[PDB]
């Protein structure tokens, strides 16, 4: 094996769907969503 499928998950849409109240509550946890998106992007680049 050389590479695997490049997947990207939207943290905000996955956790909260399309709800603004849930997004406001999600902002209380800091930058977890940013870290998760960053890690997935790094994996995607590493596959190429």
């Amino acid at each position: 094996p050389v590479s695997m499928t490049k997947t990207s998950v939207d943290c905000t849409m996955y956790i909260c769907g399309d709800s603004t109240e849930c997004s406001n509550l999600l902002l209380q946890y800091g930058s977890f969503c940013t870290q998760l998106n960053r890690a997935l992007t790094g994996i995607a680049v590493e596959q190429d």
């Binding site: 990207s8 939207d10 905000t12 849409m13 399309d18 998106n37 992007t41």
Partner: protein
């Protein structure tokens, strides 16, 4: 929110953006109308 370049700048927390492609946000189609579909019954409940 001024333009995609400024959104890229404000996502990276920097005033200078190097050459490359950056994930900034997500496009989503907003709804237009509200639809309610309830049964044709009208007889009030015998709560009284």
């Amino acid at each position: 929110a001024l333009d995609p370049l400024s959104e890229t700048k404000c996502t990276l927390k920097s005033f200078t953006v190097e050459k490359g492609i950056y994930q900034t946000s997500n496009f989503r189609v907003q709804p237009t109308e509200s639809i309610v579909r309830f049964p044709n019954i009208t007889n009030l409940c015998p709560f009284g």
